[PDB]
From a paper:
Many NLR proteins nucleate the “inflammasome”—a large macromolecular complex that triggers inflammatory cell death and cytokine secretion in response to microbial or danger-associated ligands. Like many other supramolecular assemblies in the human innate immune system, the inflammasome complex relies on homotypic and heterotypic interactions between the death domains (DDs) to initiate, amplify, and propagate pyroptotic signaling. Inflammasome sensor NLRs can be grouped into two categories based on their DDs: PYRIN domain (PYD) and caspase activation and recruitment domain (CARD), both domains were found to form filamentous complexes to initiate the inflammasome formation. Extending this analysis, we also found that specific type II interface motifs directly dictate the compatibility of heterotypic pairwise CARD-CARD interactions among [name], [name], NLRC4, ASC, and CASP1.
To test this, we solved the structures of recombinant [name]-CARD and [name]-CARD filaments using cryo-EM, both at 3.7 Å with Gold standard FSC = 0.143, without masking. Similar to [name]-CARD, recombinant [name]-CARD also formed ~8 nm-wide filaments, but these filaments are more rigid and adopt a single conformation. [name]-CARD and [name]-CARD filaments display similar helical parameters (5.36 Å and −100.8 degree for [name], and 5.409 Å and −99.16 degree for [name]), suggesting a similar mode of assembly from the respective monomers. Despite near-identical helical parameters, [name]-CARD and [name]-CARD filaments have remarkably different surface charge distributions, that are not suggested by their monomer structures alone. By contrast, in [name]-CARD filaments, the positively charged patches on the monomer are mostly buried inside the filamentous oligomer, exposing a predominantly negative surface. In contrast, the [name] Type IIb surface is partially negatively charged (Tyr531, Tyr527, and Asp525), whereas the Type IIa surface is positive (Lys508, Lys509, and Leu512). Hence, [name]-CARD is structurally compatible with CASP1-CARD but not ASC-CARD. In agreement with the structural predictions, [name]-CARD, but not [name]-CARD, preferentially stimulated CASP1-CARD oligomerization, as demonstrated by the appearance of slower migrating bands on native gels (lanes 2 and 3 vs. 4 and 5), whereas the reverse was true for ASC-CARD oligomerization (lanes 2 and 3 vs. lanes 4 and 5). We further corroborated that [name] is the first human inflammasome sensor that is unable to engage ASC as an amplifier. In contrast, [name]-dependent pyroptosis was not abrogated in ASC (PYCARD) KO keratinocytes (blue bars).
Residue numbers in the entry:
A (entry chain G), B (entry chain K), C (entry chain D), D (entry chain H), E (entry chain J), F (entry chain L), ...: 451 to 537
Write the structure that this text describes.
């Protein structure tokens, strides 16, 4: 959870395609259908990432954990990238 | 990695057919199937190269290194060409 | 290399059968198998010559030199012919 | 008419594309052009369905009947589905 | 019907070419022409499968049964595959 | 099944003419006519092998077994060759 | 003009490809380039026909006459078809 | 000017896209950028036309004349249409 | 006309080469050059049959009659075959 | 230039294969590689001619002159044909 | 800069493909990524040109000079065209 | 700070998109979320810039300095533009 909040800007920049991430968060009841649609409405990837992160952080730490695992599985070079840049 | 960013325009122009490169990047889990298809959607080789380079730079340095080695194996006259033109 | 670019149209018209030239460029790793096949797909000799020349120019100066030497050995009246017409 | 009010929530969820239904209601002078446009402005299908149903219910029983026949013709598995779920 | 909902992700992945299935669903009036066109608009097979499944689930149980029988006739190795993986 | 997936690249390279294999898979209802035609559309043998293998893996383990037996009967030096190279 | 308004729904269904009709209406200064592009933006033929008809009716009777003559020249079986169905 | 005031309702209905008209009125300093944006904010074409007409009438007769010439150039069937219907 | 609609699927399967039929339909001004080319674009015979039938049915009964006579002259075993299978 | 604009439709119909003309326009820097590819994307000769003419007219009179001379060299019966039909 | 402002309307009409120009302005730090995306969102070339010109004028004279040089390099017949029409 | 106050009108006209600037001011705790949303409510860019400037000036000199550095990083041609025009 802390890792996600501290890297909010970089995740806003480098998260990438959220379709699979949105699918994961929808399978775990973290997001409703309406919320996912609201995330898909955004025009650019930066706005999509901003909306998704800002909405997930509110719900609690568990949602941040599910988001962290989903992003970790989807792309293994970005968690490692930010983990190395924070060092 | 730096070599790829500095030669972004020239690689955008002269990379050529990515099918083997796309196969390498997919075997190393740098790209998903969805991402590879999104790269293949483009109409021209210039747009394909633009999409591939722009997406690979985002992921991190390791992806740039794998891309550099794969392109180096695929064509030895372009790595030598750019290496000579930078001199 | 410059000689090849300057006579692009005339080489497009008068190069002729590329099978031996394609064999040379393939032995020197200038072309892959896929690229040679793509050159062989073209229907007429003008399109074959156009594809081969346009692809060789992209790779770099070394490829143009290998192509020039291969064409020079394969046919001695075309290098001499163009060399005389440029005068 | 009663069937529409009693199943308002389920119709809000499962009506689907209203373009044909909106065309029917416009041909029968139940809706004006402005009202149809206002229904199409909504962002999601749930909001479109809610707006359309809420606007049709006010007008009267006859409008509800026209809506029921139009929806019945458009999709035959939804009237039968809801008729079975009410049992 | 339950079999389709429980295997939503796997069917989303492995359904394949929908032309014959879409033809069946159009012959059985489960889908209109507009809906079939909207399913064919998608760029990849994963998105086509997602749209088709999500739209079929909405209509009701009968549509889910027709989809199950149509997929069963079209490909006998996928119904058998999922039936074996659920065991 | 594992033998086919692990050697996907080598089978992609050395399988050869698929007409007999496609005939086998068509007689066993693993492939439809449309799928066989789509495999035959490809221009090169590498693309034909890639399409066929990628489509067969999706269907399930039984299809992979039929593919292995068909390739084994068609050419006995390729199953033995790959079995020897994995050692 | 009256024939076009009275057959609005049927023309919405059966007009077909508008490219030639749009070219005619553009040659007669009934539509601008922007308007033709807006008609071409639509996804399906039904939406294209709906937009075109709705835009042509607005401008006046002369535009409806030009549309009737252009459609009459382009396809002679549809004017005869609707003319027969109104009888 | 009088023609515009007397046909306020019909112009409110049939004026259409104002982007070109707004561009003309902006080139002639009849409207500022802020006013044009205020016209573009409206949701429907009827409200846009109402806002534009109501704003132009206040400014004076010359603005109404410029509006008349701009509408005359933009669409030649609507000025002729209203002129014929007023007869 | 009815015979064509009732046997739409079987004609989709067994019509075969349309070149002569397309020639007839072009001689009778039922199809334009563009439409014939659009039918010829399809990759398989099933898709060609689908495009041709779907386009001919739209135009009207006369086009279906011309299609019936042309196919009847081209092949006398398919009209007889379907006429026998409907019995 | 005027000859080209006035006969836009006839050139749109009868120009034919543009490969040589495209080569000329590419040699004179009237078209880039991207523009030539965009012209080559079209499916039919009518669409290719429409794209080429519409793009060349935009650039200016000089481009129209180069196009007229190139078409004049490629085919001497079409310039003479249109020159005779305008008389 | 003055040349760009004075020819604002004609440049809005005749600028053409902006991909290369956008590449220039992005390489020279005149535009951010968000701004380039906002320029690419527009539907037509007229709206793209309107957004691009209106945004470039705001930044200052230096941006206008860079834009003028980029447009000059991209197309040499349009700067000459406007230069000749202004005379 | 003085540079910001003296160019308040010009910054009101030419600041542009504040999303990045708002992000900076929010990262530096100059603005809360509520204030950023209140700035985003405004209808035009002129009103957004007016609200942002008017709110930042009140808070103090440090906020004006952070605003100057953020605008300097966001756009390097506007700080140079105003600095040159004040000369």
């Amino acid at each position: 959870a802390a890792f996600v909040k501290e890297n909010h800007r970089q995740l806003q920049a480098r998260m990438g395609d959220l379709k699979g991430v949105l699918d994961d968060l929808q399978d775990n009841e973290v997001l409703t259908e309406n919320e996912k649609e609201l995330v898909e409405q955004e025009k650019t990837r930066q706005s999509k990432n901003e909306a998704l992160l800002s909405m997930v952080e509110k719900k609690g730490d568990l949602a941040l954990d599910v988001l962290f695992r989903s992003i970790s599985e989807r792309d293994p070079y970005l968690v490692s990238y930010l983990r190395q840049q924070n060092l």
